[PDB]
Design a protein around this nucleic acid. Sequence first.
RNA 1: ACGAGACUCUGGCAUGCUAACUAGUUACGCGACCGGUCGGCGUAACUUCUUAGAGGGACAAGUGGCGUUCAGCCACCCGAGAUUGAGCAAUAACAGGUCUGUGAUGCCCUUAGAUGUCCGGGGCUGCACGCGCGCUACACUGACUGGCUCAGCGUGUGCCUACCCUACGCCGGCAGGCGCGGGUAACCCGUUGAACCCCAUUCGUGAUGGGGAUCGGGGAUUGCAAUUAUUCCCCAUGAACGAGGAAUUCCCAGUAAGUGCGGGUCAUAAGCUUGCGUUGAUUAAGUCCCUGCCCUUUGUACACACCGCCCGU
Lengths: 57, 189, 72, 62, 143, 138, 67
Amino acid sequence: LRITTRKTPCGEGSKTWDRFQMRIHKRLIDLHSPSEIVKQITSISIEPGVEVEVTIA
Amino acid sequence: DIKLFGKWSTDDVQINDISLQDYIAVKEKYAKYLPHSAGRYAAKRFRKAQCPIVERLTNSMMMHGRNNGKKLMTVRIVKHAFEIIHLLTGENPLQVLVNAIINSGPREDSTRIGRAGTVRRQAVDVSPLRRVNQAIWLLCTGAREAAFRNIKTIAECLADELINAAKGSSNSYAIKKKDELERVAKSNR
Amino acid sequence: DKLNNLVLFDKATYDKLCKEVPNYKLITPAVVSERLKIRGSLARAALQELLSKGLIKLVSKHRAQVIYTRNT
Amino acid sequence: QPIKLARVTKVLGRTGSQGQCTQVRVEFMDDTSRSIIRNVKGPVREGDVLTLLESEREARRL
Amino acid sequence: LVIPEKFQHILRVLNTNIDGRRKIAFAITAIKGVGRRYAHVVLRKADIDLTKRAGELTEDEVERVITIMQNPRQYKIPDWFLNRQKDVKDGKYSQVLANGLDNKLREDLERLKKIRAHRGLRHFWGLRVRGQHTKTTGRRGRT
Amino acid sequence: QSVQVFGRKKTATAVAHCKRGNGLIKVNGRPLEMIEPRTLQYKLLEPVLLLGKERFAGVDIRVRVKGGGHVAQIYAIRQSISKALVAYYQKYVDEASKKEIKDILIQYDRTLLVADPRRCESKKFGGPGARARYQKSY
Amino acid sequence: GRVRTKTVKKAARVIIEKYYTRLGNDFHTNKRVCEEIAIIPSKKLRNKIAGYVTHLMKRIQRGPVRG
RNA sequence: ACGAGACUCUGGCAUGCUAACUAGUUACGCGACCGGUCGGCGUAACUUCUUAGAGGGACAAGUGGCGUUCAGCCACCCGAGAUUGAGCAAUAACAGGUCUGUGAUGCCCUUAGAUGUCCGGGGCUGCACGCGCGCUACACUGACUGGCUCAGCGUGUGCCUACCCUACGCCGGCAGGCGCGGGUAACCCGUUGAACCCCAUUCGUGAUGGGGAUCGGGGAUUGCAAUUAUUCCCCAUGAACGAGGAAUUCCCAGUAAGUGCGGGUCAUAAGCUUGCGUUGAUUAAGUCCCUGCCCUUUGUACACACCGCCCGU
């Protein structure tokens, strides 16, 4: 997510541009398991910063 | 057994100048079917002179305005005007071009006066590499000015300018500017 | 007012168009248009007509760069 | 002046207001007893041959 | 080839100073109402050999071209490709030779100046109105 | 089944799927000579006459190429073809012939099987290009 | 420019001084021993130190080392 | 010790590894002639192209030359690469800009204009004018159906709001409307079918098919009215320009230049700007000549520091 803004809060100076970058990473796993076992598996150990979603395939 | 394009041979060419033969490449391993190869010649010294002479000559063809960066158009206008010189003369175009370069590459001209000085100019030897650079530049520029404001189109001015430079006709821009450079060299002793 | 170059197949056009031109190896529309003082379009038309007459073989032509090669 | 080629034998250095001339020792392959300083123009390597229709002039040196 | 009779050098459609050396559809562009694209369409519809100039042709071709020109609606030319479609006062019909309707489309401009309208008076003053900004115009040869 | 060899130039990339055959060469629905430019055609023909038609007579390689630009799509077809031939020979028949063809290709063009590392450089603000800068008045 | 920095030069000096016995004439072995015997947080810095280590070893092969 | 470097992200190589019906390479029922085009399919060889995850790889490492025989520089077999590009970036400062970001702010407005609510309309879109960035042109290396071949960055279904990208058929040469919807996205646009290279038919040295107020009339968006109307598809004319006398920006290899696309712009709105591929250069391996800046020595009666100080009438 490259987005570029002007450094100065005014118009004075040289053309200076902040180039802010946010990177988003995606993982997918597909399993053959009943919903109870998947639910038990998911909430066994997590660390803040990752978003986990369970979807029907 | 490599031939330029499809019919030009690289065994009938001879330098017979000894001055600029390592900076002209038509007979050695630098033989190829297409005057379009990009390459890394212009990224280091001692490697810029290994580019084939026809490759450099077609590289310097495009210039001015949108015409720059159209190397394929240069390949077309080089196969053209080369068919034209071969039909006009009947001789091998590569040897004619080498003759034009030998006749057009200046030998001596003026720069700054030795240790220091800028009021006037002092005559010095021209390197073979800079002289082939100058010869190619004059060839291209004379051709494009000959096309400039003229009824005749491209692939003609290249052809006639090259053939006059090979023969020495004053209508050639390359060798007339050559003689001009040596006249400045003489006048600035 | 306007510069005059012949846009018709005229007496000067018909003269030295099929007998003396092949004696010169350089056969291109610009040279013809300069020799007999016509436009480029008429020179291209004349070379196309003489090609259709089955006189001289073709080498190439993109839009206006056409090459004719003799046999003698 | 007699025509006699000279081959580069050592690249002395750079001179000129903008540093474009190059001092280089050039030797004539006729007696190998003469090795004169020549200022030259343009990209000059070591070991090429410089055509010389004029040799009565010398480059500033020493 | 050489035509032995009736070669013209000053071609004339209607009080128009046009060249006879010019190619057909390259000289008839002098009409102040139609030309270029409309001319090409009209001559391609009238079945004229484009590969010929404006002198190596018979009079019938020019006659029928003029007839189809002065009567666009009679010969399958739509009411979208032309510049006299209905407008103020009364709708305009028939595009005729030279400034036969260019005078008609300048007299509406005259009306716009005579009624004292903002757009009209800006047309009178020499200030273009269709969206033209003014920052460097009217700087060379201004009064 | 491919020799798994690929070939690149600029952002373009080409791979020659390889199988036992009789030297029929095809590039994405077309053989090696009907490629459109007809002036870059010599660039595509470079290998097949650089080493001869006989070497391209006992292996069927189909070159699939994905990338930008015409000429950048070239220098990928040809390099992929040459390096696919060299890898096929190396892994199947022997090395002596493979070594001979590799030496031939390198001598003609050292960048015949190595990729060209150069890529378009990023653009920095205050200028249109990588190294060009906006004009200003003093 | 390829001039070594006093950080790389100083670390290579300390490595030669303290761990001479393990260090050899090959660059790659120098890299491995420098990784094993010291905490060098950057692969590039490891490699610069190993290269200076190799050059220093060649210098001792010449004979005396001044530094 | 800080800064430089180191650092991080990037650009390039691993047929080595963890592996992927949101990607393809391999799995075949016209085998269309008796060994073949597929993304015209003729409806379970597994990660090689694609995907950035962990390691590896380059270090002046080997050779030669120069060099305190140091630090290093130059040339080469080899190697993907022998200098990728950026980000950050010290001490001190400038009366540089910003009170047009806010109870984050030190002063006036308190007596019915105290803005905390509000505007119907015009302003920076209009001018005798000089200036600054950039585009369209400078030709027959250019054009007059363009007929056939591709990628790159990356954006997109919204609760302050139909306010998205839109695939497919219907309405018309046209801006636009209808439907079924595909896409919350490597699931759809998209295999992102533009710039280009071609041509065994048509421009030919004009002021013009190299060109724009091609003057004026035909157009319109499930949303306040397109008024010197910043939106718009159609139909000739024309100003002007023959490389632009001074003065000169900016340019070290996928660099300059050659063009198109995507965001910020945005209810429609790119000559701007910010990124992106797309073609590939004679040119430079140098220097202090100019313009500056830094350092050293030197002089100083300056220290508010030469925009200083100071003398006399």
